[PDB]
Design an enzyme around this catalytic site. Structure first.
Site, PDB file in Angstrom:
ATOM      1  CG  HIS A  67     -15.902  -4.341  -0.045  1.00 41.66           C
ATOM      2  ND1 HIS A  67     -16.439  -5.617  -0.066  1.00 41.66           N
ATOM      3  CD2 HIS A  67     -14.984  -4.470   0.841  1.00 41.66           C
ATOM      4  CE1 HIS A  67     -15.737  -6.375   0.964  1.00 41.66           C
ATOM      5  NE2 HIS A  67     -14.826  -5.588   1.433  1.00 41.66           N
TER       6      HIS A  67
ATOM      7  CG  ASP B 204     -18.074  -7.328  -2.481  1.00 44.09           C
ATOM      8  OD1 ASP B 204     -17.896  -6.194  -2.990  1.00 44.09           O
ATOM      9  OD2 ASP B 204     -17.546  -7.841  -1.468  1.00 44.09           O
TER      10      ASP B 204
ATOM     11  CG  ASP C  57     -17.888 -15.059   9.943  1.00 40.85           C
ATOM     12  OD1 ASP C  57     -18.467 -15.804   9.252  1.00 40.85           O
ATOM     13  OD2 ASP C  57     -18.161 -13.880   9.880  1.00 40.85           O
TER      14      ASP C  57
ATOM     15  N   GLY D  58     -10.802  -7.808   7.234  1.00 39.80           N
ATOM     16  CA  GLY D  58      -9.301  -8.127   6.875  1.00 39.80           C
ATOM     17  C   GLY D  58      -9.025  -9.342   5.967  1.00 39.80           C
TER      18      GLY D  58
ATOM     19  CB  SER E 172     -12.705  -7.901   2.337  1.00 43.64           C
ATOM     20  OG  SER E 172     -13.321  -7.498   3.501  1.00 43.64           O
ATOM     21  N   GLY E 173     -12.457 -10.117  -0.082  1.00 42.52           N
ATOM     22  CA  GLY E 173     -11.506 -10.701  -1.056  1.00 42.52           C
ATOM     23  C   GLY E 173     -10.933 -12.120  -1.301  1.00 42.52           C
TER      24      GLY E 173
HETATM   25  N1  LIG Z   1     -16.814 -11.567   8.038  1.00 41.53           N
HETATM   26  C1  LIG Z   1     -16.144 -10.540   7.373  1.00 41.53           C
HETATM   27  C2  LIG Z   1     -15.459 -10.732   6.290  1.00 41.53           C
HETATM   28  C3  LIG Z   1     -14.952  -9.764   5.666  1.00 41.53           C
HETATM   29  C4  LIG Z   1     -15.079  -8.475   5.974  1.00 41.53           C
HETATM   30  N2  LIG Z   1     -15.054  -7.465   5.694  1.00 41.53           N
HETATM   31  C5  LIG Z   1     -15.507  -6.020   6.485  1.00 41.53           C
HETATM   32  C6  LIG Z   1     -14.961  -4.707   6.350  1.00 41.53           C
HETATM   33  C7  LIG Z   1     -15.460  -3.831   6.929  1.00 41.53           C
HETATM   34  C8  LIG Z   1     -15.183  -2.409   6.854  1.00 41.53           C
HETATM   35  C9  LIG Z   1     -15.858  -1.518   7.734  1.00 41.53           C
HETATM   36  C10 LIG Z   1     -17.329  -1.386   7.430  1.00 41.53           C
HETATM   37  O1  LIG Z   1     -17.973  -2.212   8.151  1.00 41.53           O
HETATM   38  O2  LIG Z   1     -17.492  -0.376   6.836  1.00 41.53           O
HETATM   39  C11 LIG Z   1     -14.310  -2.188   5.904  1.00 41.53           C
HETATM   40  C12 LIG Z   1     -13.860  -3.102   4.899  1.00 41.53           C
HETATM   41  C13 LIG Z   1     -13.063  -2.842   3.873  1.00 41.53           C
HETATM   42  C14 LIG Z   1     -11.926  -3.574   3.370  1.00 41.53           C
HETATM   43  C15 LIG Z   1     -11.090  -2.936   2.348  1.00 41.53           C
HETATM   44  C16 LIG Z   1     -11.616  -1.918   1.497  1.00 41.53           C
HETATM   45  C17 LIG Z   1     -12.610  -1.117   2.080  1.00 41.53           C
HETATM   46  N3  LIG Z   1     -12.856  -0.161   1.127  1.00 41.53           N
HETATM   47  O3  LIG Z   1     -14.311   0.285   1.293  1.00 41.53           O
HETATM   48  O4  LIG Z   1     -11.909   0.678   0.473  1.00 41.53           O
HETATM   49  C18 LIG Z   1     -13.360  -1.577   3.184  1.00 41.53           C
HETATM   50  C19 LIG Z   1     -14.400  -4.548   5.198  1.00 41.53           C
HETATM   51  O5  LIG Z   1     -13.580  -5.394   4.228  1.00 41.53           O
HETATM   52  C20 LIG Z   1     -16.202  -7.013   7.324  1.00 41.53           C
HETATM   53  C21 LIG Z   1     -16.046  -8.257   7.248  1.00 41.53           C
HETATM   54  N4  LIG Z   1     -16.401  -9.354   7.772  1.00 41.53           N
END
Ligand SMILES: Nc1ccc2[nH]c(-c3cc(CC(=O)O)cc(-c4cccc([N+](=O)[O-])c4)c3O)cc2n1
Lengths: 254, 94, 149
Positions: free
Chosen positions: A41, A90, A186, A190, A192-193
């Site tokens: 994502h 993902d 948790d 931020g 993500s990945g």
């Molecule tokens: N426990 C976690 C771990 C990683 C997470 N990442 C996110 C996350 C949330 C959003 C805002 C939403 O809820 O739509 C956006 C991103 C996000 C990060 C990087 C890039 C993009 N993107 O679509 O280009 C979205 C998230 O990782 C929630 C989250 N929760």
């Protein structure tokens, strides 16, 4: 990362930080000098495909020290089954432009052999997730790298213990759950990945990728990760193919 | 119950309220000291004892393997790295 | 594959056996046991028995709390996975040997450096007797008295 501690600089050597136009994008894992794995994502809203860089060696995002190495990301390959906006499939394989130099602050994480993943790593209770993402559901992101040790659960017990809804995806066979449900610890926005790493007899392997399941540290919920085991084959195959002509690439999956 | 010597492989039986308790010897376990601990050397059973990878073969012992960057050692279970920054090792804790 | 049900711990002087149902028509069972924070260890690999002996593992730390699960596989494709690609299983109650084992100096299945320990070396002053004799561990919630001779 919510509930985590700061990663003693050098103890998370496979941690990557992706940047777009200078701004933080996601995290990622280094599996070898030119290959990094991250979360599909993160490339859902990228229309500046060359302004994407990856940093290794990184630790404190405020000062520069003698360690950070940065390489532009030459290619981003995602399962052709991922859907722009979901949590299923993902995973993204990023091909750097030039390799990095391993050093005490930059080493890759072993991409384990499927069987070993499924049969041995998967019953190692605790693994680590790390990142510079929010430290509380909607708080400040971090500057030093933070790492969290979580327990993993099998879907039956995850489903069993989660509260029932929200607009959640299902835990497919391409995901797994880890975390606490007492909204204490948790992964978070931020992160993500970034990686979910299991330590088995002296080595760390990549068992999961921080996906976005659970806004962040909710109650009655666990964090969802991409089950890497289901993709070793795919990655490997991609890592040995010729460069093909595209920054974003959607490779056939399986 | 004990009278009817239910404990095998050297085990001693202790009687209870019809039931008994079998005290086995170090290499066996089970209600009647019958399972032999040395016959489950499979990859599903503690990774076959392999440090990194394990393979089970038809009618022949399982083989341990190593990840790219390491070599299996003499004992056939442990792997050692052949490189400088072998994956999954943390140089500062080495 | 049906999952196991009625998982029960049967334990006297630490000899701990788990039992369960059903009796398996064309499927096999494998048992895993862990502590609250331990990794899962597997026992009684692909059996058709409905009992598994975990003494070996629970006598390591009789004061921990163990949890176990039994997986059911058809026989043949004992790789079997369901929708979320893992094998069908069911968990047991928690068992804390030291507080839930049954009692009857006596030897226990607890072993220390190759030997077996005894009722008292395992329960020190938490073990009292009665007079006919009964063994009682007053600092318990369940299975506090034994039987008599
Ligand atoms: N426990 C976690 C771990 C990683 C997470 N990442 C996110 C996350 C949330 C959003 C805002 C939403 O809820 O739509 C956006 C991103 C996000 C990060 C990087 C890039 C993009 N993107 O679509 O280009 C979205 C998230 O990782 C929630 C989250 N929760």
């Amino acid at each position: 990362i919510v509930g985590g501690k700061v990663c003693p600089k050098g103890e998370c050597p496979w941690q990557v930080l992706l940047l777009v136009n200078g701004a933080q994008l996601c995290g990622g894992t280094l599996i070898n000098t030119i290959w990094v794995v991250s979360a599909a994502h993160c490339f859902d809203k990228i229309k500046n495909w060359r302004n994407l860089i990856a940093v290794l060696g990184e630790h404190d995002l405020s000062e520069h020290d003698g360690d950070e190495q940065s390489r532009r990301v030459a290619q981003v390959i995602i399962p052709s089954t991922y859907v722009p906006g979901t949590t299923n499939h993902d995973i993204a394989l990023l091909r750097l432009h030039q390799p990095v130099v391993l050093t005490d602050h930059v080493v890759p994480l072993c991409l384990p052999e499927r069987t070993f993943s499924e049969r041995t790593l998967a019953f190692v209770r605790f693994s680590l997730v790390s990142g510079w993402g929010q430290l509380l559901d909607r708080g400040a992101t971090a500057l030093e790298l933070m790492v969290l040790n979580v327990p993993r659960l099998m879907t039956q017990d995850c489903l069993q213990q989660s509260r029932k809804v929200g607009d959640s995806p299902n835990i497919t066979e391409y995901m797994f759950c880890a975390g606490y449900s007492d909204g204490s610890k948790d992964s978070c926005k931020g992160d993500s990945g970034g990686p979910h790493a299991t330590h088995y007899r002296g080595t760390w392997y990549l068992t999961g990728i921080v996906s976005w399941g659970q806004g962040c540290a909710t109650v009655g919920h666990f964090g969802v990760y991409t089950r890497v085991s289901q993709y070793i084959e795919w990655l490997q195959k991609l890592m040995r193919s010729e460069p093909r002509p595209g920054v974003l690439l959607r490779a056939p999956f399986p | 119950q004990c009278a009817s010597s239910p404990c095998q492989n050297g085990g001693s039986c202790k009687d209870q309220l019809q039931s008994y308790i079998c005290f086995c010897l170090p290499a066996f376990e089970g209600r009647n000291c019958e399972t032999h601990k040395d016959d489950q050397l499979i990859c599903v059973n503690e990774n076959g004892g392999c440090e990194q990878y394990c393979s089970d073969h038809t009618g022949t012992k399982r083989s341990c393997r190593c990840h790219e960057g390491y070599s299996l050692l003499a004992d056939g279970v442990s792997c050692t790295p052949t490189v400088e920054y072998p994956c999954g090792k943390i140089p500062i804790l080495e | 594959t049906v999952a196991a049900y009625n998982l029960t711990w049967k334990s006297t002087n630490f000899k701990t056996i788990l039992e369960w149902e059903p009796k398996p028509v064309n499927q096999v069972y494998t048992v895993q046991i862990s502590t609250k924070s331990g990794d899962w260890k597997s026992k009684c690999f692909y059996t058709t028995d409905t009992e598994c002996d975990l003494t070996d593992e629970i006598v390591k730390d009789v004061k921990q709390t163990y949890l176990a699960r039994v997986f059911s596989y058809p026989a043949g494709n004992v790789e079997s996975t369901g929708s979320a690609g893992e094998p069908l299983y069911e968990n047991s109650p928690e068992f804390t040997p030291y507080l839930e084992t049954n009692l009857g100096d006596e030897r226990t299945l607890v072993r220390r450096n190759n030997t077996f320990l005894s009722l008292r070396d395992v329960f020190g002053k938490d073990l009292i007797y009665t007079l006919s004799v009964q063994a009682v561990i007053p600092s318990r919630t369940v299975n506090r008295k034994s039987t008599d001779s």
